[PDB]
Design a protein around this ligand. Sequence first.
Ligand SMILES: CCC[C@H]1C(=N)N(C)C(=O)N(C)C1=O
Ligand SMILES: CCC[C@H]1C(=N)N(C)C(=O)N(C)C1=O
Ligand SMILES: CCC[C@H]1C(=N)N(C)C(=O)N(C)C1=O
Lengths: 300, 237
Amino acid sequence: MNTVPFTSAPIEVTIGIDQYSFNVKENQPFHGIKDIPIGHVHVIHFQHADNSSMRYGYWFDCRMGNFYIQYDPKDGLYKMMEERDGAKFENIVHNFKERQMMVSYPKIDEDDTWYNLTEFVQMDKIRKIVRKDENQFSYVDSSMTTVQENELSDPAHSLNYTVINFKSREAIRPGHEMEDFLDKSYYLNTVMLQGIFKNSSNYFGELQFAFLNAMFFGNYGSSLQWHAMIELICSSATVPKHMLDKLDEILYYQIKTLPEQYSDILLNERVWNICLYSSFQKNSLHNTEKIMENKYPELL
Amino acid sequence: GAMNSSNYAELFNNDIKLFVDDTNVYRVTVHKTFEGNVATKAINGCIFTLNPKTGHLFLKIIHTSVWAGQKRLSQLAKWKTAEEVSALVRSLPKEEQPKQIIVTRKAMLDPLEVHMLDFPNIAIRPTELRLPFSAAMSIDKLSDVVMKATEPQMVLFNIYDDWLDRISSYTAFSRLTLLLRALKTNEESAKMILLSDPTITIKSYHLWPSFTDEQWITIESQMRDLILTEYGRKYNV
Ligand SMILES: CCC[C@H]1C(=N)N(C)C(=O)N(C)C1=O
Ligand SMILES: CCC[C@H]1C(=N)N(C)C(=O)N(C)C1=O
Ligand SMILES: CCC[C@H]1C(=N)N(C)C(=O)N(C)C1=O
C-alpha cells in the first residue's frame, strides 16, 4: 500500500482519488492519501472552489517512483512531483502516518470497481497519449484537445489518442466502399487491431483511458474518442467472441460508475441507440443493454 | 452547406458543378405471382447528372443485370450511383472536373462522400430545393434510350437543346424545371401542351420542340396554369 504525501492544502479544493473524493478547506491540516492499492494505475484530481472550469489531475503508478503533491502559488495549482531521495520520502511518509494527517484510500474489500475500470490501462501507454517524457506521471485537464481535434492548438499539450475516422481513406479500401462503410470489420481487425494497436488489450486500454478522462475531467475530446471506439466495434459484423464479451463487461462497469448528474453530457444518444438497437452487435452486449435500459431509459 | 433559394444564383456562376439525381436508378414493377404472392421485376433505370450552367446531361443507363443476385437493392442503388458518378469524375480532365456535386436526396451524401475521398477538394452538398428531376423519364427520347439499352451505357445530351443561344442559363434552368414540374404534375396535360401544334416539331438532335421566343412565353404560361390549377383543386385553394 503506497502513499502520496502533500506539503499542505493552502486553497480550498475538492480532491479526487480514482472514483472517491473529499473536500479540503483552505489551510486545513491535510497531508495526503495513504493505503493506495499497488498494482493499478491511479488518478488524483482537483477542482478549486473558485474555478467553474478546469478540473485537472495526474495519472500515476506508485511502482514507478515516489510522488508528492505541493501547491504552487505562482502557477496556482496543485503540482505532482517525483522525489529521488528515497530516505527523505520514507522519513516524511512516516511522520505524517504518525500524526494521522492523511486520508486513507477507502476501498471496500468486496469492491472490484477500480480494477474493472482500469483492467487494460497501463502507465506506459498513458505516457504515449500524454507526451511529457521528463515525468513518470501524466497531467490531464478539462481543456486539453486531441490530435484529431487539432486537425479539425498547442501540440505539446494535446491528447494523442489514435485517430478514428469512418469517412477516411484509412477506413475504406478502394473498391469496397459500400462494404467497408456499412461493415467496419476491415478497419477494426486489419487496420486498427493488427496494424496500430497490435492486440485488443491495447485497444481496450485506450478506450478505458478515454472514458476515465471524459468522466473525471469533462474532457470533450476524450468523450468523443470513447464513443468512437465503441461504435467501431459495434459497427463491425466480424469481431472475436472474446472481445465482445470483454467489451460488454467494460461498458457495464463504466455505465455503473457513471455520476447520474453528468450522464446527459457523458452519453451520446445517437451512438448508444445505434450500438444497442441497430448495429451488428445489438444482441451481443447483454449486460450493458440491461444496465442502460434500467438506469438511463430516457436516453433510449 | 445546403443549397436553397437564398443562394440560387450560385448554380450559374463559373465554378463547374453537377446535380446528381438518383430517383430513377432502381425502378420496378410490382406484380402478383402464380401463388398469389407479390414480387418485383426490375426495369432499366438511369442516373441523372446535370451541369445546370451548360445543360450537359451525363445519362448513365443502369441495366437490370446490375441487380442480379444482389440484396437490399434500394440501398445498393445509392452506392452504385455514387460509384458511377465517381467514375465519371475520374474520366474527366482535371480542368473539367466539378468543384461541387449537389445531390437531390440527402441519402446520397454519405455514399458519394465515401466514393469521392480521393477528391477532398470537391464539395458534396445537399439541397432544400424540391427539384423535379424524377420526371426526366417523361421526356420521350430519354425514356426511349433507357428502355432500349441491353447493356450498361452512358449517353450525353444537352437538356437545354439550343436555348442558350438566346437565353441565359438561369432562364434555361427555370424553363427546364417548369417543364419537368408540369410533366410530374399532369404528364398527359403537359405533353398535350407541348405538342398540340403539329407545325412545331422536335428536331432529331433535340429533346424539346423548336418554339420561337414568343411561343415559349405562351408555353411557359400554360405550364404555370396547369400546375397552379392543380395546386388549387388538390388543396381546395
Ligand atoms: C522537502 C520539502 C518538499 C517535500 C514535501 N513537503 N513533501 C510533502 C514530500 O513528500 N516530499 C517528498 C518533499 O519533498
Ligand atoms: C463530465 C463531468 C465532469 C465533472 C464535473 N464537471 N464536475 C463539476 C464534477 O463535480 N464532477 C464530479 C465531474 O466529474
Ligand atoms: C464530457 C464532455 C462534456 C462536454 C463538454 N465538456 N463540452 C465542452 C462539450 O462541448 N460537450 C458537448 C460535452 O458534452
